[PDB]
């Protein structure tokens, strides 16, 4: 991403081993950057 959405503090949390890759992925799933771009425009069935 052109230095976009990304993960300020998210990157340090994943590296540092404060957070584990599964966890980081879960954070990424529920975020504005994600809601917009994949759930912003779709009935309830293809977004699932």
């Amino acid at each position: 991403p052109p230095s976009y959405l990304r993960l300020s503090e998210a990157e340090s949390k994943l590296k540092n081993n404060e957070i584990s890759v599964r966890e980081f992925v879960r954070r990424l799933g529920r975020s504005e950057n994600y809601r917009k771009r994949f759930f912003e425009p779709y009935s309830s069935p293809k977004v699932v």
Partner: protein, 68 residues
């Protein structure tokens, strides 16, 4: 806004996986409070060992400012 900071050891006991896996089984991870009840059950239903837990983030008091 409350994050526990658990630590576990889960030992694979159904498959003898063949590559890597060190960090898969002995690891420290803050997991948010909303999900920590399930993560603990999942560690326990795999014969895992929950070595440590902490509050880490939240105050250990409550009512306002907890369930955000």
């Amino acid at each position: 806004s409350r994050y526990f900071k658990v630590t576990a050891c889960i030992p694979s006991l159904k498959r003898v996986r063949t590559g890597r896996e060190l960090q898969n089984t002995f690891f420290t991870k803050l997991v948010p409070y909303e999900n920590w009840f399930t993560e603990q059950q999942r560690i326990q239903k795999a014969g895992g060992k929950v070595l440590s837990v902490k509050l880490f983030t939240g105050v250990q008091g409550a009512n306002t400012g907890v369930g955000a």
